[PDB]
Amino acid sequence: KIEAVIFDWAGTTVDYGCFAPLEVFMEIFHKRGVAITAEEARKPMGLLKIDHVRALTEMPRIASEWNRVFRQLPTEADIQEMYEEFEEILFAILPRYASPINAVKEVIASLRERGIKIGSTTGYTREMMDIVAKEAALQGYKPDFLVTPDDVPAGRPYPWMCYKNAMELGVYPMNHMIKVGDTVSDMKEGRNAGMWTVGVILGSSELGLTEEEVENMDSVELREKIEVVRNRFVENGAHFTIETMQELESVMEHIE
């Protein structure tokens, strides 16, 4: 079994902690006087950027807090406007948060050795990826194929992007594919796609941590946190959790 692996981008292979979009989601909302936590603004991470914005205006607190200031819930105009602001800020600093996360490369290197194809589903737009891919390639990492919510009719909770990878790589049986990701969104996407869903933790968005505070964080603590991210993935569709790409192969191994 297993003829192909499909990787999330920002959080699984590139951008540790998935930080590019973070402050921005918070920024646009703060200019309106709403203010949300780095937590909420990271719940629906995985979705098509605009959907991600739309989801933020829909959470009760946010959606309520909003009403308390404008005396009415958020309009398309608003969100549509908020996205336009997001679109240019994120677009400007997007080049930085783009270097591959410490580990992957060797793993892909290994995976391609046993003749395994590498696909790639993502939350960024086509216009965005153009960027993230060039530099990500320049730093070594060029999956065999890339899909975006533009290529298909719908965002990410749907398998749609995955199908296009399978169609492109040329692997028939949906259950001959591993889906590695770092968010709740991916879990579903993998399960809905009918694939083996693996979910990395350290570097993920879930855990949501950099380094000078993971590699410089108190044992228990961190272990206690990994343990919180691990459950979320499992209790959200996920057949296996991992603490990093090094442990991936072994999972494939066990899928026998």
Annotated binding site for Mg(2+): 8, 10, 182
- For residues 247 and 239, is the Cβ–Cβ distance under 8 A? no
108 or 184, CB closer to Mg ion?
A: 184
- For residues 19 and 26, is the Cβ–Cβ distance under 8 A? no
The reply on whether position 51 binds Mg ion by CB under 5 A is no
Among 78, 158, 234, 244, binds a copy of itself (CB under 8 A): 158
The reply on whether position 148 binds Mg ion by CB under 5 A is no
Among 46, 143, 159, 199, binds a copy of itself (CB under 8 A): 159
Q: Give the integer Cα–Cα distance in Å for 79 and 56.
A: 9
Annotated binding site: 8, 10, 182
The reply on whether position 173 binds a copy of itself by CB under 8 A is yes
11 or 74, CB closer to Mg ion?
A: 11
The reply on whether position 10 binds Mg ion by CB under 5 A is yes
Q: Which of 14, 160, 151, 187 is nearest to 96 (CA)?
A: 14
Q: Give the integer Cα–Cα distance in Å for 151 and 148.
A: 6
Report 181-200 residues binding a copy of itself (CB under 8 A): 192, 194
The reply on whether position 151 binds a copy of itself by CB under 8 A is no
How many other CB atoms are there within 10 angstroms of residue 247's CB atom?
Answer: 16
The reply on whether position 175 binds a copy of itself by CB under 8 A is yes
Among 63, 152, 217, 255, binds a copy of itself (CB under 8 A): 152
121 or 205, CB closer to Mg ion?
A: 205
Q: Determine which one of 8, 15, 51, 186 is catalytic.
A: 8
The reply on whether position 180 binds Mg ion by CB under 5 A is no
Rg (C-alpha) for the chain, rounded Å, is: 18
- The CA–CA distances, whole Å, from 101 to 14, 31, 182, 191 equal 5, 32, 12, 25
The reply on whether position 160 binds a copy of itself by CB under 8 A is yes
Q: Determine which one of 15, 43, 49, 164 is catalytic.
A: 49
- Estimate the crossing angle of helix 126-138 against helix 76-93, to 10 degrees: 20
- Strands of the 4-7 sheet, one edge to the other: 117-120, 4-7, 177-181, 196-200, 240-242
**Residues recognised as catalytic:** 8, 49
> By the criterion CB under 8 A, which residues form the site for a copy of itself?
152-154, 158-160, 163-164, 166-168, 170, 172-175, 192, 194
